[PDB]
Amino acid sequence: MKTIFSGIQPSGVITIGNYIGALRQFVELQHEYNCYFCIVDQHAITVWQDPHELRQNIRRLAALYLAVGIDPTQATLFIQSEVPAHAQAAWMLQCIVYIGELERMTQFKEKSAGKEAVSAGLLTYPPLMAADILLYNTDIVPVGEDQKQHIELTRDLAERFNKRYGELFTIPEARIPKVGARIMSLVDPTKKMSKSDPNPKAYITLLDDAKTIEKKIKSAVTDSEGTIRYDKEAKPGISNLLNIYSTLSGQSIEELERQYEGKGYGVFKADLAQVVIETLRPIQERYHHWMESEELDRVLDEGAEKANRVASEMVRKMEQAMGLGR
Amino acid sequence: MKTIFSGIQPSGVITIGNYIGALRQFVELQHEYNCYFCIVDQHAITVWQDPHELRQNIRRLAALYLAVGIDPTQATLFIQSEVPAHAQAAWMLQCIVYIGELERMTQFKEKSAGKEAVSAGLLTYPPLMAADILLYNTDIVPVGEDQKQHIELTRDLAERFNKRYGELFTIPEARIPKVGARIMSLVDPTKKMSKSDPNPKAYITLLDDAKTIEKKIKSAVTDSEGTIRYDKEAKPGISNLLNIYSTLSGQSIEELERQYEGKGYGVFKADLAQVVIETLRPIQERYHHWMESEELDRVLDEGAEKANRVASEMVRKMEQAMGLGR
Numbered sequence: 001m002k003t004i005f006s007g008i009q010p011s012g013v014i015t016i017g018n019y020i021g022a023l024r025q026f027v028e029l030q031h032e033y034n035c036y037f038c039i040v041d042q043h044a045i046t047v048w049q050d051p052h053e054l055r056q057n058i059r060r061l062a063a064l065y066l067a068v069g070i071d072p073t074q075a076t077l078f079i080q081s082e083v084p085a086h087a088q089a090a091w092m093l094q095c096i097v098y099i100g101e102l103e104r105m106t107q108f109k110e111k112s113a114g115k116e117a118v119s120a121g122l123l124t125y126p127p128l129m130a131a132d133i134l135l136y137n138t139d140i141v142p143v144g145e146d147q148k149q150h151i152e153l154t155r156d157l158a159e160r161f162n163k164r165y166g167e168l169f170t171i172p173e174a175r176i177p178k179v180g181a182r183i184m185s186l187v188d189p190t191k192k193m194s195k196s197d198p199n200p201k202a203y204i205t206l207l208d209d210a211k212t213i214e215k216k217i218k219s220a221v222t223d224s225e226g227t228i229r230y231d232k233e234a235k236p237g238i239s240n241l242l243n244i245y246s247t248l249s250g251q252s253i254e255e256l257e258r259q260y261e262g263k264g265y266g267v268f269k270a271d272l273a274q275v276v277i278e279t280l281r282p283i284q285e286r287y288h289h290w291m292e293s294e295e296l297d298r299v300l301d302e303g304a305e306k307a308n309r310v311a312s313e314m315v316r317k318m319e320q321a322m323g324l325g326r
Numbered sequence: 327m328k329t330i331f332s333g334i335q336p337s338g339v340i341t342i343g344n345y346i347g348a349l350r351q352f353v354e355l356q357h358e359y360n361c362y363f364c365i366v367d368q369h370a371i372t373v374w375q376d377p378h379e380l381r382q383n384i385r386r387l388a389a390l391y392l393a394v395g396i397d398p399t400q401a402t403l404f405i406q407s408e409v410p411a412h413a414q415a416a417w418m419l420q421c422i423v424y425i426g427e428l429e430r431m432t433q434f435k436e437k438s439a440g441k442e443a444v445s446a447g448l449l450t451y452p453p454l455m456a457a458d459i460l461l462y463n464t465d466i467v468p469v470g471e472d473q474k475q476h477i478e479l480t481r482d483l484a485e486r487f488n489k490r491y492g493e494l495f496t497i498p499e500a501r502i503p504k505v506g507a508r509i510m511s512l513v514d515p516t517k518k519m520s521k522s523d524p525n526p527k528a529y530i531t532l533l534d535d536a537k538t539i540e541k542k543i544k545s546a547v548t549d550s551e552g553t554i555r556y557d558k559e560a561k562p563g564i565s566n567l568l569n570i571y572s573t574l575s576g577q578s579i580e581e582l583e584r585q586y587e588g589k590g591y592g593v594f595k596a597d598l599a600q601v602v603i604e605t606l607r608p609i610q611e612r613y614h615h616w617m618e619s620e621e622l623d624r625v626l627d628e629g630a631e632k633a634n635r636v637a638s639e640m641v642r643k644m645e646q647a648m649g650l651g652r
């Protein structure tokens with residue numbers, strides 16, 4: 001049985017983009033693999049988080065992991081900062097990666113561009129992510145398309161460690177879904193939907209109510225051609241909405257194109273809103289159950305004990321390979 | 327009673343420069359303050375260390391700390407990597423410091439210049455050093471002159487944390503000795519003596535034997551004026567040797583100038599070598615005692631337990647201020 005690791009930042013409430021690109025597949029993969037799923041709060045603070053909001057986003061993400069169907073007896077669910085080994089291995093991998101490699105990362109370039117001063121944590125985001133992955137001898141990392149480059153750097157860091165010091169790490173491999181690997185923003189269809197977007201109209205969160213979802217879909221930007229057909233270059237907004245519709249309803253894109261012949265954007269968007277609402281309905285109900293209870297903390301307690309045992313042993317091996325300590 | 331923290335890298339065997347600028351003063355300060363003295367092996371690997379050499383340099387530095395008179399009942403002696411809180415607080419402070427501040431650090435600029443690829447750990451050396459200091463509510467940091475800028479950044483990071491999140495850190499202050507704060511290299515008197523110099527002639531280590539010390543002092547570069555007098559700009563080599571002589575023998579510089587009127591560089595250097603040798607003689611004897619015994623490990627074991635208790639509590643407060651975890 002191979003091992004899976006994946007994380008999500010408590011930098012906000014997860015979006016349908018996070019759901020379609022990652023979390024939805026976690027729920028199937030837990031039955032086929034040894035799975036670790038992580039709330040990566042040390043990654044979240046690489047940009048400013050208000051402390052009260054961050055504490056609460058951590059609880060909410062834990063509740064949403066379990067609400068969408070992750071079974072804490074089939075997968076290990078835990079908070080990054082409660083496992084000190086992650087920071088320990090991240091320091092060691094920071095001494096392996098070169099500065100030039102971190103500066104050419106697309107996400108660092110995008111998230112720092114135009115900013116006068118950004119934190120060192122933003123630059124050193126990959127070594128901590130590589131630590132999360134590599135500590136558990138991970139084979140498969142399910143992520144959306146935007147993380148492919150980070151996984152490629154992780155493979156490089158693991159090879160480098162293994163060849164500079166001796167074979168220790170499994171070389172992980174990304175698993176990127178064929179559909180929905182990059183949901184686009186509702187207000188700018190040339191950039192991806194991000195849960196930290198300063199514009200709330202850009203994303204649907206899993207906790208948005210019905211009136212909010214209706215507003216956000218009906219104001220999603222589209223062209224003026226008036227024809228519901230998939231075409232990424234010429235109709236990027238409608239294409240994105242057809243992708244969300246298709247993957248949540250199970251109807252193919254061409255089935256939806258046929259379903260909306262001679263139909264206007266207005267009835268298409270009204271319908272899509274109800275597809276998303278009906279999708280989120282059972283999720284939000286299990287979410288409220290987990291938020292109201294102390295069972296949520298026991299799951300995370302148990303998860304951190306299990307993760308600590310595995311990770312702190314791999315840290316011992318890393319230190320012995322590098323010659324640290326005794 | 328105020329608190330002292332200082333560290334030394336196991337990147338090599340400590341030099342008379344490390345002794346004169348720092349370690350020698352640790353031995354007096356342990357009786358006046360609550361003292362933490364650290365073997366900072368996570369800092370050492372920011373550049374390449376051979377694992378076997380690093381393991382052994384860690385033991386040797388512990389032995390030399392105790393050999394020069396640090397009492398493990400008056401000071402806490404421990405290895406950085408055995409206290410996970412250091413890496414944990416270093417990550418948090420990496421999210422506080424800005425990249426621009428790390429790039430303007432003199433040591434980073436000096437240690438990376440001319441190198442094609444350096445590690446991210448070299449750049450993020452200060453946040454880990456600021457973590458070491460700040461975790462113990464340190465008041466005073468005894469260091470040589472070359473660390474003044476790092477302490478200034480540490481004060482900035484502490485103020486920033488305190489004002490962004492609430493008062494938590496003591497603002498530390500450097501204590502730089504008036505004499506011997508910057509021993510110069512024996513082969514290039516315009517740069518400081520460094521224990522990682524690729525040229526062993528540049529430094530005297532505390533473990534150098536008599537014939538080695540004699541060779542290194544007699545080949546120390548000097549001018550050709552032939553006059554033993556202190557003048558930093560025109561006679562930087564002889565000035566440095568007069569500084570080492572003065573501070574190890576207790577004779578003032580002008581006393582030594584009078585002592586060597588009409589004397590040549592050859593008798594001056596021969597004499598200085600024996601001053602250094604006689605200085606190192608009792609140190610090397612206590613060093614060999616500590617290396618041959620398991621008592622060295624018990625000291626470090628006890629030190630790490632004491633440091634962990636203090637540091638892991640400050641990490642809890644840091645996490646609660648930033649909103650990490652629960």
Ligand SMILES: Nc1ncnc2c1ncn2[C@@H]1O[C@H](COP(=O)(O)OP(=O)(O)OP(=O)(O)O)[C@@H](O)[C@H]1O
Pocket residue numbers: 007008009010011012015017018020021022142143144145146147180181182183184192193194195196197
């Ligand atoms: N538009 C998106 N479409 C599909 N998957 C996504 C999308 N955005 C993020 N992901 C995936 O969701 C997972 C979690 O990523 P993350 O926690 O960074 O969400 P995010 O929306 O990008 O938040 P942030 O803006 O703070 O980075 C990753 O595997 C990531 O590739």
Ligand SMILES: Nc1ncnc2c1ncn2[C@@H]1O[C@H](COP(=O)(O)OP(=O)(O)OP(=O)(O)O)[C@@H](O)[C@H]1O
Pocket residue numbers: 333334335336337338341343344346347348468469470471472473506507508509510518519520521522523
């Ligand atoms: N020439 C020097 N003169 C006086 N003090 C020094 C000198 N070099 C280092 N120090 C002091 O010794 C202490 C320990 O520093 P460190 O462990 O980095 O030694 P180092 O010789 O600089 O080794 P490296 O070359 O690996 O950096 C610091 O307080 C530092 O300021």
Ligand SMILES: C[C@H]1c2c[nH]c3cccc(c23)S[C@H]1C(=O)O
Pocket residue numbers: 005006007008009040043128129132133141142143147
């Ligand atoms: C959530 C972030 C990260 C934390 N450590 C891991 C481990 C696996 C996948 C990811 C991550 S995905 C990445 C991202 O920025 O998308």
Ligand SMILES: C[C@H]1c2c[nH]c3cccc(c23)S[C@H]1C(=O)O
Pocket residue numbers: 331332333334335366369454455458459467468469473
């Ligand atoms: C030894 C290094 C470092 C590790 N953490 C600390 C704490 C205090 C003083 C120093 C240090 S001095 C610094 C240096 O590079 O000189």
Ligand SMILES: [K+]
Pocket residue numbers: 011012048049196
């Ligand atoms: K946020």
Ligand SMILES: [K+]
Pocket residue numbers: 200205
């Ligand atoms: K919002």
Ligand SMILES: [K+]
Pocket residue numbers: 184189232235236237239240
């Ligand atoms: K599109």
Ligand SMILES: [K+]
Pocket residue numbers: 337338374375522
């Ligand atoms: K070395």
Ligand SMILES: [K+]
Pocket residue numbers: 526531
């Ligand atoms: K040497």
Ligand SMILES: [K+]
Pocket residue numbers: 510515558561562563565566
């Ligand atoms: K000089």
Ligand SMILES: [Mg+2]
Pocket residue numbers: none
């Ligand atoms: Mg992201």
Ligand SMILES: [Mg+2]
Pocket residue numbers: none
């Ligand atoms: Mg140094």
